[PDB]
Design a protein around this nucleic acid. Sequence first.
DNA 1: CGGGTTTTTGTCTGGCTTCACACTTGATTTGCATCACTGTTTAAGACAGGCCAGATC
Length: 73
Amino acid sequence: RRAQKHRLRELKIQVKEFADKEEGGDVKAVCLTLFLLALRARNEHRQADELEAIMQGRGSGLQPAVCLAIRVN
DNA sequence: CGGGTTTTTGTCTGGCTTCACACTTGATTTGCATCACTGTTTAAGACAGGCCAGATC
């Protein structure tokens, strides 16, 4: 952890200054879409969409009507 | 060869943070057992008498 901190502090300062100046310090959504598109580049739409969900926040499970629909159909 | 340059760690004392967590008590959920009910014979194959029928002395 400390290892990768050292390894990447240069990119850290780079991206933080550039994103803070560009969009007004909203590094959250900037880096969000950054990693989204970067991971989609290698055709990981599965992981990209589940990460879109995890950040969006929604429906980890199902509600009883849907489970009933499944075991009936 | 043993000595020296990387990655990797310890490391600072502050203020920050999210969140587990104390301590009841009943209203829920969830796990795991029970429960009552269903199918409605043979089919090949070995051995033994027993009866009869045809052979034989």
